[PDB]
DNA sequence: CTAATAGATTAGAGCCGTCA
């Protein structure tokens, strides 16, 4: 599903997902496929944990473009939504029945 | 052996069209029912209030957890879930120097005390809602922990103004209701509970584990005071009007002379949910008897049919007259000869105090929620405290009680009956629970009695309940 | 905190790096390369930044027309920027200009 | 070669920034700015050196 | 009107627990 279906990576970045066997294999095939193809923003990272500071994150996504969640998680929703219809990120109809 | 049955939860609206039987789930997963732009808030208290205020405001912006996710659902924050903004920058502020309050806080006596408190705090109050530019939403008023300990009807210190209630809380909310301004009353040990200790280094109240609860509580109350719909009932059928009665002892004078409220529901026929208090006082001078003479009872019931009419354009098809007392024929007869003749009237009593527990032979979790025994066809036991299977555990703590109901008057099904007294439980608005265990028609009433029973000098009060609770 | 790394580009520089690592090797200091000192068979991102993270004093680079724009090469000195920026040394990365 | 860069502190510059940028962009004139035309998730520093 | 004996129904205050 990482190679051939997914078409946006968001990564959930805090204490416990920083150094995780799991999320850090998951996070190197993303890149394989980021390198695969054209698309040098296919990895979206979320930093969520007030305790995980800046300088503490790990080199895979060290020099990414995150998205603040700390302060609120509204406007980090707001950024997301932005962000995915500046990239043009398929999607369908809104639809709030299917999350129901 | 005796036959039970089970009634169904009756689930609750949202934005979008979108149903669920929990309010906390709903807020966080789709959102209210208007939109809001942002509440602008005014404080009323000493300095450290104001700052206390600012924290609790600056700490509601986040993520606040409990400590079991599935018992007690998190909070996302303010603008995740209300969609609005509420934070400490829209905020005036009005002194309240703290030697005034040491000062009138001392005359030894409760009445005289309390009224110039009160008096204290609603003069700021009022001059600053008649000459000012600013706009207020709600007011909040920070109040210290030695003006709540002392201001109680029996506290003690270790004529005029006696035309009061002694309680801070009613006298303040009677006498701002002739200005129409909504306001919410916090404690200084509420919003910063971590500082306040006893002789012991350990807080008094202790919220660690809670703290996302009260976020709950606290937000819905706040963004309800400011005019906002935070949900709505689902399967309210059309030409029902739901009439809750309440009796209170008015006393502070030599006539007891009792007094009754009413609250008021049904459908507002746009899809929506008209729910306010249907309340002119109405005496009955002869003491212990909680039953309305037929003028009074002729009154009550043309002005609520009158207020359906006018709202909807038509009279009613079906009213409950929901009560915790039984009707006379007197009583009664006034009732009906006012009542529209294609119009059903049913009176029904709920009580609590009839003694029946029913203990799970195996288990050390009680009866499951909505289970009912139909003693007849006119008398019921309804548990609206149990077991709840959605959020792993029981309304209560012990072996709950459940409600003795009675058709006590009129011709209806006790099953439909069972069943609109659950819905009922799902509208504390004063609340952010998963279901009450009394209908609101009930509480509302008892609260707005409570409130207008602290001056005498209140006409054509209000009737929204954002100025009451 | 001993350890002096050294950043090229693999293997477009291995003559002057080996050169220059045998060099200070034989001078008497410790050097970590990524031609001579990383395992085989091991999770070489984390032990990378493990390295640069807890156990190096300097950071040599090796700067030409290859390791220049190169993705190891980035986010090395991104994290050693990190590193430079919680030791408060104004001297802990320093380029080596080998290209004409 | 035809857009004004502009480079400012963060976040103590940003309201007289946003005011600029949209009174340039208003009047014409093609604007980079990280507040505005800054992408999330991509590699910002060599998108700002490029 | 009034002082006792019941049953049966009403309202008012006030305190304690919410983890695990
Ligand atoms: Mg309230």
Same mark, same amino acid.
């Given at each position: 599903?990482?190679?051939?279906?997914?078409?946006?990576?968001?990564?959930?970045?805090?204490?416990?997902?920083?150094?995780?066997?799991?999320?850090?294999?998951?996070?190197?095939?993303?890149?394989?496929?980021?390198?695969?193809?054209?698309?040098?923003?296919?990895?979206?990272?979320?930093?969520?944990?007030?305790?995980?500071?800046?300088?503490?994150?790990?080199?895979?996504?060290?020099?990414?473009?995150?998205?603040?969640?700390?302060?609120?998680?509204?406007?980090?929703?707001?950024?997301?939504?932005?962000?995915?219809?500046?990239?043009?990120?398929?999607?369908?109809?809104?639809?709030?029945?299917?999350?129901? | 052996?005796?036959?039970?049955?089970?009634?169904?939860?009756?689930?609750?609206?949202?934005?979008?069209?979108?149903?669920?039987?929990?309010?906390?789930?709903?807020?966080?997963?789709?959102?209210?029912?208007?939109?809001?732009?942002?509440?602008?808030?005014?404080?009323?208290?000493?300095?450290?209030?104001?700052?206390?205020?600012?924290?609790?405001?600056?700490?509601?912006?986040?993520?606040?957890?409990?400590?079991?996710?599935?018992?007690?659902?998190?909070?996302?924050?303010?603008?995740?879930?209300?969609?609005?903004?509420?934070?400490?920058?829209?905020?005036? @502020?009005?002194? !309240?120097?703290? &030697?005034?309050?040491?000062?009138?806080?001392? =005359? +030894?006596?409760?009445?005289?005390? %309390? #009224?110039?408190?009160?008096?204290?705090?609603?003069?700021?109050?009022?001059?600053?809602?008649?000459?000012?530019?600013?706009?207020?939403?709600?007011? @909040?008023?920070? !109040?210290?922990? &030695?003006?709540?300990?002392?201001?109680?009807? =029996? +506290?003690?210190?270790?004529?005029? %103004? #006696?035309?009061?209630?002694?309680?801070?809380?009613?006298?303040?909310?009677?006498?701002?209701?002739?200005?129409?301004?909504?306001?919410?009353?916090?404690?200084?040990?509420?919003?910063?509970?971590?500082?306040?200790?006893?002789?012991?280094?350990?807080?008094?109240?202790?919220?660690?584990?809670?703290?996302?609860?009260?976020?709950?509580?606290?937000?819905?109350?706040?963004?309800?005071?400011?005019?906002?719909?935070?949900?709505?009932?689902?399967?309210?059928?059309?030409?029902?009007?739901?009439?809750?009665?309440?009796?209170?002892?008015?006393?502070?004078?030599?006539?007891?002379?009792?007094?009754?409220?009413?609250?008021?529901?049904?459908?507002?026929?746009?899809?929506?949910?008209?729910?306010?208090?249907?309340?002119?006082?109405?005496?009955?001078?002869?003491?212990?008897?909680?039953?309305?003479?037929?003028?009074?009872?002729?009154?009550?019931?043309?002005?609520?049919?009158?207020?359906?009419?006018?709202?909807?354009?038509?009279?009613?098809?079906?009213?409950?007259?929901?009560?915790?007392?039984?009707?006379?024929?007197?009583?009664?007869?006034?009732?009906?000869?006012?009542?529209?003749?294609?119009?059903?009237?049913?009176?029904?009593?709920?009580?609590?105090?009839?003694?029946?527990?029913?203990?799970?032979?195996?288990?050390?979790?009680?009866?499951?929620?909505?289970?009912?025994?139909?003693?007849?066809?006119?008398?019921?036991?309804?548990?609206?405290?149990?077991?709840?299977?959605?959020?792993?555990?029981?309304?209560?703590?012990?072996?709950?009680?459940?409600?003795?109901?009675?058709?006590?008057?009129?011709?209806?099904?006790?099953?439909?009956?069972?069943?609109?007294?659950?819905?009922?439980?799902?509208?504390?608005?004063?609340?952010?629970?998963?279901?009450?265990?009394?209908?609101?028609?009930?509480?509302?009433?008892?609260?707005?009695?409570?409130?207008?029973?602290?001056?005498?000098?209140?006409?054509?009060?209000?009737?929204?309940?954002?100025?009451?609770? | 905190?001993?350890?002096?790394?050294?950043?090229?580009?693999?293997?477009?520089?291995?003559?002057?790096?080996?050169?220059?690592?045998?060099?200070?090797?034989?001078?008497?200091?410790?050097?970590?390369?990524?031609?001579?000192?990383?395992?085989?068979?091991?999770?070489?991102?984390?032990?990378?930044?493990?390295?640069?993270?807890?156990?190096?004093?300097?950071?040599?680079?090796?700067?030409?027309?290859?390791?220049?724009?190169?993705?190891?090469?980035?986010?090395?000195?991104?994290?050693?920027?990190?590193?430079?920026?919680?030791?408060?040394?104004?001297?802990?990365?320093?380029?080596?200009?080998?290209?004409?």
């Amino acid at each position: 599903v990482i190679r051939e279906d997914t078409c946006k990576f968001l990564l959930v970045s805090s204490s416990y997902s920083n150094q995780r066997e799991g999320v850090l294999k998951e996070l190197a095939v993303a890149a394989k496929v980021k390198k695969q193809l054209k698309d040098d923003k296919f990895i979206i990272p979320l930093a969520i944990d007030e305790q995980l500071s800046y300088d503490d994150i790990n080199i895979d996504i060290v020099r990414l473009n995150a998205i603040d969640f700390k302060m609120s998680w509204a406007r980090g929703l707001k950024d997301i939504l932005e962000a995915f219809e500046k990239q043009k990120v398929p999607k369908e109809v809104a639809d709030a029945s299917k999350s129901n | 052996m005796k036959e039970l049955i089970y009634i169904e939860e009756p689930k609750i609206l949202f934005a979008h069209g979108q149903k669920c039987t929990d309010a906390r789930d709903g807020l966080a997963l789709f959102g209210p029912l208007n939109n809001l732009y942002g509440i602008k808030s005014g404080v009323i208290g000493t300095k450290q209030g104001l700052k206390i205020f600012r924290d609790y405001l600056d700490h509601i912006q986040k993520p606040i957890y409990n400590s079991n996710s599935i018992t007690r659902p998190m909070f996302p924050g303010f603008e995740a879930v209300f969609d609005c903004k509420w934070e400490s920058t829209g905020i005036t @502020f009005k002194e !309240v120097t703290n &030697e005034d309050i040491g000062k009138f806080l001392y =005359n +030894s006596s409760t009445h005289k005390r %309390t #009224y110039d408190l009160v008096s204290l705090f609603i003069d700021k109050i009022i001059s600053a809602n008649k000459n000012e530019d600013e706009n207020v939403d709600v007011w @909040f008023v920070i !109040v210290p922990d &030695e003006i709540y300990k002392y201001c109680r009807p =029996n +506290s003690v210190l270790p004529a005029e %103004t #006696y035309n009061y209630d002694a309680q801070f809380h009613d006298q303040f909310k009677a006498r701002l209701l002739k200005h129409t301004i909504p306001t919410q009353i916090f404690r200084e040990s509420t919003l910063a509970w971590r500082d306040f200790k006893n002789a012991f280094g350990l807080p008094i109240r202790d919220f660690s584990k809670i703290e996302g609860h009260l976020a709950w509580t606290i937000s819905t109350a706040a963004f309800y005071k400011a005019g906002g719909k935070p949900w709505k009932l689902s399967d309210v059928r059309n030409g029902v009007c739901y009439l809750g009665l309440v009796y209170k002892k008015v006393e502070k004078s030599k006539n007891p002379r009792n007094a009754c409220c009413a609250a008021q529901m049904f459908l507002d026929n746009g899809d929506g949910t008209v729910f306010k208090g249907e309340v002119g006082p109405w005496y009955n001078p002869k003491n212990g008897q909680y039953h309305l003479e037929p003028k009074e009872a002729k009154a009550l019931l043309s002005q609520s049919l009158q207020s359906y009419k006018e709202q909807i354009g038509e009279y009613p098809k079906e009213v409950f007259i929901h009560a915790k007392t039984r009707f006379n024929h007197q009583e009664w007869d006034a009732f009906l000869e006012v009542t529209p003749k294609e119009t059903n009237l049913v009176g029904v009593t709920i009580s609590k105090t009839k003694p029946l527990k029913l203990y799970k032979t195996e288990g050390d979790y009680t009866i499951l929620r909505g289970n009912a025994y139909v003693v007849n066809e006119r008398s019921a036991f309804l548990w609206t405290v149990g077991y709840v299977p959605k959020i792993q555990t029981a309304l209560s703590m012990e072996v709950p009680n459940p409600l003795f109901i009675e058709i006590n008057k009129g011709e209806a099904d006790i099953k439909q009956v069972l069943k609109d007294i659950l819905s009922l439980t799902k509208l504390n608005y004063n609340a952010c629970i998963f279901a009450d265990g009394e209908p609101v028609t009930l509480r509302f009433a008892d609260k707005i009695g409570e409130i207008l029973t602290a001056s005498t000098d209140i006409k054509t009060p209000p009737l929204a309940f954002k100025y009451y609770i | 905190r001993n350890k002096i790394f050294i950043s090229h580009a693999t293997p477009d520089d291995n003559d002057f790096t080996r050169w220059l690592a045998l060099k200070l090797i034989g001078l008497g200091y410790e050097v970590w390369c990524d031609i001579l000192f990383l395992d085989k068979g091991v999770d070489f991102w984390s032990n990378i930044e493990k390295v640069i993270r807890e156990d190096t004093c300097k950071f040599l680079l090796v700067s030409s027309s290859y390791s220049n724009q190169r993705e190891g090469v980035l986010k090395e000195l991104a994290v050693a920027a990190k590193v430079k920026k919680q030791l408060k040394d104004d001297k802990f990365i320093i380029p080596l200009a080998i290209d004409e």
